[PDB]
Design a protein around this ligand. Structure first.
Ligand SMILES: [Mg+2]
Ligand SMILES: [Mg+2]
Ligand SMILES: [Mg+2]
Ligand SMILES: [Mg+2]
Ligand SMILES: [Mg+2]
Ligand SMILES: [Mg+2]
Ligand SMILES: [Mg+2]
Lengths: 189, 92, 99, 180, 144
RNA sequence: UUGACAUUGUGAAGAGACAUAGUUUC
RNA sequence: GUUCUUUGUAAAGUGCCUUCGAAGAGUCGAGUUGUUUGGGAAUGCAGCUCUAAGUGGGUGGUAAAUUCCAUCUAAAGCUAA
RNA sequence: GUUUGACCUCAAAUCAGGUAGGAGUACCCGCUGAACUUAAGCAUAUCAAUAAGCGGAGGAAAAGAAACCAACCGGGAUUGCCUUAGUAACGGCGAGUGAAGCGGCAAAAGCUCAAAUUUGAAAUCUGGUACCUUCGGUGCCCGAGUUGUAAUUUGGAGAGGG
């Protein structure tokens, strides 16, 4: 298979070939619109690693996002979500009929970062009859990227096991509310 | 030393005295053991199973030999047990 | 290292009959296979060297491997990764020039 | 301080929740009859030096224990045995106890055929009550005194001393080795 | 014509077929297992990383390869719209001599001929107006 | 307002380092 | 509880020997800035810069270097009470 | 052949069939974010990671089957209650601030991709049409797809051979 070679080559990012490719591709992406449909994944191995399948019902959208800090609207602050999450949310708002599955980095410059977002059509009969992918047709999975249920959303929320994630193990506000509640029983203890 | 954490191998180690050592035997067998103290039928007491970490020696015990199993013991407690005729078998 | 049987000292703990569980396959998570060795060697040959790797090679050839390790620690972060990178560069030089 | 009056939990529904839990247990027993409401759990040793004097119920039997009993993990799961793939066996006594529990369970259960008439039987609701966890015995009630001047207090002191001075003696031995 | 074979096999219940091997993963595996007699690689592949490693792999495994123009041409070869790669693995006795002669011809015309020139950097071409300006400046500097 | 880093690429000439075959620095 | 075709040399489980055993990258990790939990070194998140390895990698709550040890297998995903 | 085409990319149609918006919002998942107040004075902490503002769901949501807890004779997805504990620790160790593992209990359930050549046969799938026993099935056809759709394996393993 060619996917192992693709993974190793994509890791070797400082090589001359990959530098030339990223330069010409970032120029092409700057020429195109801020959000636009991609005919095919530029990184097929990465896409299918993240869950993309080459069949009817899977869509790729390329999106650029502005870099830097958040600007507070007042006539050095940091956004608590990532630029990847911002790109996912904008692509989801564009294609509200689809469900965001994952996304991956492709390129960047001093002004923009560039991502490709994978989306699944929950109305397409191939997806609806596919037992491996019909879980996303359930209404509980509407706007996963908007609720922070994607990989980058859970990474930003800090959803992990261990002592390092006590405040954000299952819900930061949930555990704050659980801790800051006075519990009184019928027979006071 | 400020912000000192007493973190040792045995943070849990409740203490028990020799005057309360004989309370770990059921009352039915206790009278029989006291009546016929023997050097080949010494009652075996599991202080760890009773829920104790260290055996201290505040009290006085009769001259009945008892086999005592404990994680830790004090010098005076061991001396009194041996003087009464028992022995201390260390356990973990 | 069998347990002594007491509550303190070296090898403290209760003596129980030991068993040897079967090795877990997940413990060999980062093992090198023939396929991945072949693929990595071919990809390295095709792609060449990174700019900082070339700078490290020049530093090794013209100056001390200690300074090379210092620069590698600055570029990569941890000193262990610096050591591994410098060893890789030395292997590259030895396999390219000597044999 | 904080606005604590906006978050006050009063358990007025303690009795109602108890009634609801009993109703749920009865409903699940009726739906699942005749198999019990719980799976068979193994005997494990509690961690830490505070609780390691006791045994309790673990999550599931190991693959080694299931194989020694003579079953596969999938079949044991289908017949109502909890199987845990991440617990490891390093204690022969615990391994033997779990194998004995599995064999006794297999002897005391009856598995109905997939096709054919079912032998009707009343359901037993608690596998845990049917196969209780027993604390293993450590020693007999009475033994003979065998004292040889051991001085267990001195044994503890010497063990602490050798643990304290293990490293320095090894360093001195290394110095002696490196001295020619 | 596959359905014509399946009906014939159902009536009996077929010889060994010979066909062009295609598919990127399949052809890469055949090259790694040294089963491919000849490999044709399309030159206009986007993304190019799908085939950019193929010449070096073929050279290391000792598999004769040739870069050809047209993934659409390879697709017409294998009954597809496009095809990144094609491979000949087993051939008939009436065509073994032709295959050997074609391998020798590719070795003479593509491998040996382009061996040195493929090690050089490409794209050293200026625009029309820039080239004219550079030529004028060189002419003026050389001769008044 | 000032400085650093990234965006940031391609040549020529003159000075350096492998010790007078071209791989880098100013 | 009756009846329909029995599916079927189709599928699955289990013993011994030998070859193997692919496991996620602008990610992990590091510096700095802002924010958050911290008595404090230091946690969690985000921006900018640098940027890995495969007998590897993460974690082991006093800071470094050396030798060990223990325990898991990230950077993809579903799931009732 | 200055022709005829194969592709790629990008368009258009009141093209065939679909989908999103808005409401509600007690509970839930994110973003963003004060001040009144209470104190101190290594220019602060507290109120508060709250009110207000914005975005997104369900009958629950979220979390979830370890890159875990531990240092024991080890435990073994997630969640909640009791507990840890008003403890260790900070503070004229006084007032007051103040954690997690372990333990008991309620409920219990486990699993799926990527990375493999099917190469003696893309074995895969949407749509259109005609019939039927119509939450679908069969035949035919236009297509998707090798820049990889099915079967087979998910680390607890597993795969090729005998
Ligand atoms: Mg398509
Ligand atoms: Mg989920
Ligand atoms: Mg609000
Ligand atoms: Mg609703
Ligand atoms: Mg519920
Ligand atoms: Mg849910
Ligand atoms: Mg797992």
């Amino acid at each position: 298979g060619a996917y192992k070679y693709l993974e190793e080559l994509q890791r070797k990012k400082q090589s001359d070939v990959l530098r030339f490719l990223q330069r010409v591709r970032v120029w092409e992406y700057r020429q195109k619109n801020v959000i636009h449909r991609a005919a095919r994944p530029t990184r097929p191995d990465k896409a299918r690693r993240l869950g993309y399948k080459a069949k009817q019902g899977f869509v790729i959208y390329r999106v650029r996002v502005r870099r830097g800090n958040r600007k507070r609207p007042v006539p050095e602050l940091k956004y608590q979500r990532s630029l990847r999450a911002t790109a996912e949310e904008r692509v989801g708002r564009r294609a509200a009929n689809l469900r965001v599955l994952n996304s991956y980095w492709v390129n960047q410059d001093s002004t923009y970062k560039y991502f490709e977002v994978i989306l699944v059509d929950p109305q397409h009969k191939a997806i609806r009859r596919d037992a491996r992918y019909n879980w996303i047709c359930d209404p509980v999975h509407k706007h996963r990227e908007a609720r922070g249920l994607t990989a980058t959303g859970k990474k930003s929320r800090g959803i992990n096991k261990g002592h390092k994630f006590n405040n954000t193990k299952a819900g930061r506000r949930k555990t704050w509310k659980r801790q800051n509640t006075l519990s009184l029983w019928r027979y006071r203890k | 030393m400020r912000y000192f954490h007493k973190q040792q191998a045995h943070f849990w180690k409740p203490v028990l005295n020799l005057d309360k050592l004989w309370t770990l035997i059921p009352e039915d067998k206790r009278d029989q053991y006291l009546k016929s103290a023997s050097k080949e039928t010494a009652p075996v007491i599991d202080t760890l199973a009773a829920g104790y970490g260290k055996i201290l020696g505040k009290g006085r015990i009769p001259n009945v030999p008892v086999i005592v199993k404990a994680r830790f013991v004090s010098k005076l407690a061991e001396e009194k047990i041996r003087a009464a005729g028992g022995v201390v078998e260390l356990i973990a | 290292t069998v347990k002594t049987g007491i509550a303190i000292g070296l090898n403290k703990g209760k003596k129980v009959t030991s068993m040897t569980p079967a090795p877990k396959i997940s413990y060999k998570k980062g093992a090198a296979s023939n396929r991945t060795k072949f693929v990595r060697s071919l990809v390295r040959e095709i792609a060449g060297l990174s700019p900082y790797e070339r700078r490290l090679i020049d530093l090794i050839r013209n100056s001390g491997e200690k300074r090379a390790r210092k620069v590698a620690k600055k570029r990569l972060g941890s000193f262990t990764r610096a050591k591994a990178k410098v060893e890789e560069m030395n292997n590259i030089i030895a396999a390219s020039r000597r044999h | 301080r904080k606005h604590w009056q906006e978050r006050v939990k009063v358990h007025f529904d303690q009795a109602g929740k108890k009634v609801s839990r009993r109703n749920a247990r009865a409903t699940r027993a009726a739906k699942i009859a005749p198999r019990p409401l719980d799976l068979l759990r193994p005997v494990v040793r509690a961690p830490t030096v505070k609780y390691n004097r006791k045994v309790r119920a673990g999550r599931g039997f190991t693959l080694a224990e299931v194989k020694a009993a003579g079953l596969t993990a999938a079949y044991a799961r289908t017949i109502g045995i909890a199987v845990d793939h991440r617990r490891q066996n390093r204690n022969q006594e615990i391994f033997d106890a779990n194998v004995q529990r599995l064999k006794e369970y297999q002897s005391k259960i009856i598995v109905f055929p997939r096709n054919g008439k079912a032998p009707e039987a009343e359901q037993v609701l608690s596998a845990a009550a049917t196969f209780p966890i027993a604390q293993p015995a450590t020693d007999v009630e009475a033994r003979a005194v065998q004292d040889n001047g051991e001085s267990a207090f001195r044994t503890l002191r010497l063990a602490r001393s050798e643990k304290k001075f293990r490293g320095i003696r090894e360093k001195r031995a290394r110095e002696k080795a490196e001295a020619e | 014509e596959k359905k014509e074979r399946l009906t014939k096999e159902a009536a009996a219940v077929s010889p060994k077929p010979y066909a062009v091997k295609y598919g990127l993963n399949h052809v890469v595996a055949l090259i790694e297992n040294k089963k491919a007699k000849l490999v044709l690689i399309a030159n206009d592949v986007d993304p190019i990383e799908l085939v950019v490693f193929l010449p070096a792999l073929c050279k290391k495994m000792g598999v004769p390869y040739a870069i050809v123009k047209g993934k659409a041409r390879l697709g017409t070869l294998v009954n597809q719209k496009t095809s990144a790669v094609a491979a000949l693995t087993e051939v008939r006795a009436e065509d073994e001599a032709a295959l050997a002669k074609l391998v020798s011809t590719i070795d003479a015309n593509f491998a040996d001929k382009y061996d040195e020139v493929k090690k050089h950097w490409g794209g050293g071409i200026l625009g029309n107006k820039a080239q004219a300006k550079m030529d004028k400046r060189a002419k003026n500097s050389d001769s008044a």
